[model samples]
Target: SMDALQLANSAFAVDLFKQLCEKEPLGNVLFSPICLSTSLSLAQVGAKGDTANEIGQVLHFENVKDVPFGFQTVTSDVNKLSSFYSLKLIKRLYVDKSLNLSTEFISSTKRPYAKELETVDFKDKLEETKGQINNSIKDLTDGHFENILADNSVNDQTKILVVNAAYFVGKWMKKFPESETKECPFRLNKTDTKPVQMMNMEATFCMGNIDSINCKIIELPFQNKHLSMFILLPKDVEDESTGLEKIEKQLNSESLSQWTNPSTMANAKVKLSIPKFKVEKMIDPKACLENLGLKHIFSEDTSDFSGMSETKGVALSNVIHKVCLEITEDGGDHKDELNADHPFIYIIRHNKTRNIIFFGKFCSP
Candidate 1:
């Protein structure tokens, strides 16, 4: 049976993957979802009894029992179905002494009745507990980036947590020399041509000229076992952005299946030059998830995370993500940065599990 942390991590990863791949092709890129969960097992973890009574709410034990096992299985299956990504679960901690004796059951899928308790030093304990929990998570994430978790309104009581770090440092399998790169005329649109620094690399790459869309496809491999960049450029000067919609339409698991199929392999000598650019975005997963049609999971009335507490009164407090991608010459100096002047989609996934942890589009004027 899956443990509670496993269940949470799996569910979060599945939802994230479904939202990213719902409209894209599968084979052109790699995806990964890594998740972590923690708890203060032996402590009286909830609100003080006086505070609960003042709030006119007690534990929502029934809500915990209401979690649909079938729903969890479906999400897990969706994650398993992806062929070009990876999924991993980190760790879990239990704080209660009574439950500590049944550590296995506490972490396992078995449901337990809510424990009634007394006053809690939420203010001090929450801070200390969160610090410890984040340290554990950082250890699993390889300390690639730093994070901030804060509370905005003093009256809200609930803390605002933000994990705004990602480490996507990768080197090109075949290095590109800086001397080979040159200032190239990049037509931002049909009417404008900007002298942008471009990293030039010539190699035997898999390329295709899509006549129907007046576009060309180029694949760039990374050092990892299953990760690469798929660049699509328009052949006609005026059609640069013409196939963006189509490209977007094709970024999904099904399309990946067809793109990487043995029958689809082709060879072409390609001259590739893409600018180096950095984009930083802060997104609310709740809003993004809602926009992607998962409003029920976030609604105060319909949210199904009752397993965390006694009452059906939980909400996704907050979710923040920050990403950075840079392009450099083969020898490793920053050349032309692709600011993604127009619209473009970028995704990073684990090779084997195909779990899509990060997904977004950059559109700049």
Candidate 2:
């Protein structure tokens, strides 16, 4: 069962994903909301007054009674999943050397977040600092995500930088035969089309439908039964409007829970054809967080970090998120003959904890 904290995290994931979609509304959207959520939770430990209130509301932590303990449990559970797949969550908090952090804040982050806070000289050694941060992230993610921080993304005035990068590699319990991969037409829109290498397979899988939103849902499990990718494909609309627009409007924590619950899905024969493509996205979430009503932490004047450090004049500098995801003709399904030859939304979720590992959309090759 999902406790208050897990529920809050799920809500935060949906809310943030919606904002990211509206921010670009084109091409492909990919990122791990949990990575951003947990890193912000670290910052929230040092936030005070309105700063804490805004972060709490944005992360849906208002109702969560014990925020730190909740995060600790959730993060530990997620990390333990490494037995079956390579799910690496690399989180770092980079503070300027000039600032002295509070004892209480440091201890608080260490206990629940299990984070090692590092102080870097951002004032004079900006280039070296960036390289240090990038190298640390790259090494942990197996060099899949590198150069997360660009030179211009941070400056001398930067007081703190919260970085989160996630790299996941999972093979399907059922592998799709590579020989069956065929060149197929993926409908970009109703009229626009593109050629893509689409893998095909027919097997029995858990499936469901959302009549209210006119979308079909299917679960493709990895070798680990605890994790699976849920793809939501909206009914093909002939008009100019995209199919994903309608599903996005009604997506939320409550809807997501109901949509993915065991009672809502059942095993069935499904013929699935999904395109094999690799996606990489890097985003600076400062503007998106501001748009989500988190403006105080980014500004120097109104920001309050008294809980983090005794000295004043400290505010968040940047939150850099870089995610790389690839779905190939590895292990994989279906009997319902569902052809994902169009745009759709995909969610990689942990069934045990009910956490969304990755949320993205496939619009084109």
Candidate 3:
């Protein structure tokens, strides 16, 4: 059914998040897995043999059941949120001017997704090319993501660069009182605590628990009700660490579904205290993808992007994945108190599609 792609993306999302955590266990992790998946899927069109198989395995695309249509449906459904809030997932390929991409690849990408293919003078106009890439995404994402390509991020030798970015500004269905926000002690671990701006509210919200992970799940719906932010707070806040390792280790698509499943949640008067913070991160997906057994796309000798262009050795040089999220006193009520003073995982998802728009954790601020 239509949910096949959603499930596949969800699995990919969890797996990638786990890999990212392994790299920096203590730092806050944030990225749009769907955005990254779309970029790879676009490249998969030009792949063959081991190259294609690896991407398929890493992204769980083999289980999608529907090929391009499954991926297309999820992305289109996500973009539909623009009417209610500013949310966009953009994909663009900046290829070297010397190469000639196949017409079939160009048309195929356009038919399924709105990926803009452009030929740039990467050899000579390196400075202009950098600005072009950064400016294009900066404007598309409403300035949420600026300078996606930093200094020395790309060079003249770069063959192909894939860019995927997601930007969102969600207004809550129930606004948190500005007066209620105050400096509260945010626990970094068991003993360390710092003051942070915590937004507070009291209202009826869907609440549940996971005995396996020892965490509480709460849903804070956005304006349209089609979207919501779910927070998973570990019950053991007094632990020496952020107390998220167990929850992170056990997270998966199946468990995520059951946690957010409406039938499993009960509406209760929730007293919520969430910190007001914003996180901007730029990640090189190459390292994480390589760790997951997707290495052919990076090697010039083994890569086969023939489906994209006749130019041989046109392997993925650099990928620019930028994501930013801000939580303010913009948008919730009552009884079951849920205070996220320490480390916790948050997810913004499209309710209808069951697709996670953005996933990350807030540990320090």
Per-model TM-score on C-alpha atoms: 0.56, 0.94, 0.94
Which digits, one per residue and each the tens of the lDDT, describe model 1 over residues 263-363?
45467665565665444433344443454344433344554432335444443344444344444553222112122233344544433444333444432
Query: What TM-score would you give candidate 3 relative to the actual structure?
Result: 0.94
How many clashes in each structure?
39, 11, 11
lDDT (CA) per prediction: 0.39, 0.80, 0.81
| Candidate 1 C-alpha error for residue 70, in Å | 16
TM-score between candidate 1 and the true structure: 0.56
Q: State how far residue 26 of model 3 sits from its true place (Å).
A: 1.6
Which of 1 and 2 is ahead in lDDT? 2
lDDT by residue for model 3 (1-365), tens: 75577777888888888788777677788888888887788788878889988999988877566567776787787767676676777878778987787888888777566755577888799989888888988898887767878843799888888887777666788899999999999988878888999999888889987787788999988886878899988877656333545656577878877887767888899888889888877788799889888999999899888887777878889888888777787753236889999888888888887788898888787
- 10 residues in a row with least lDDT, candidate 3: 240-249
Q: Where does candidate 3 stray beyond 4 Å?
A: 238-244, 332-334
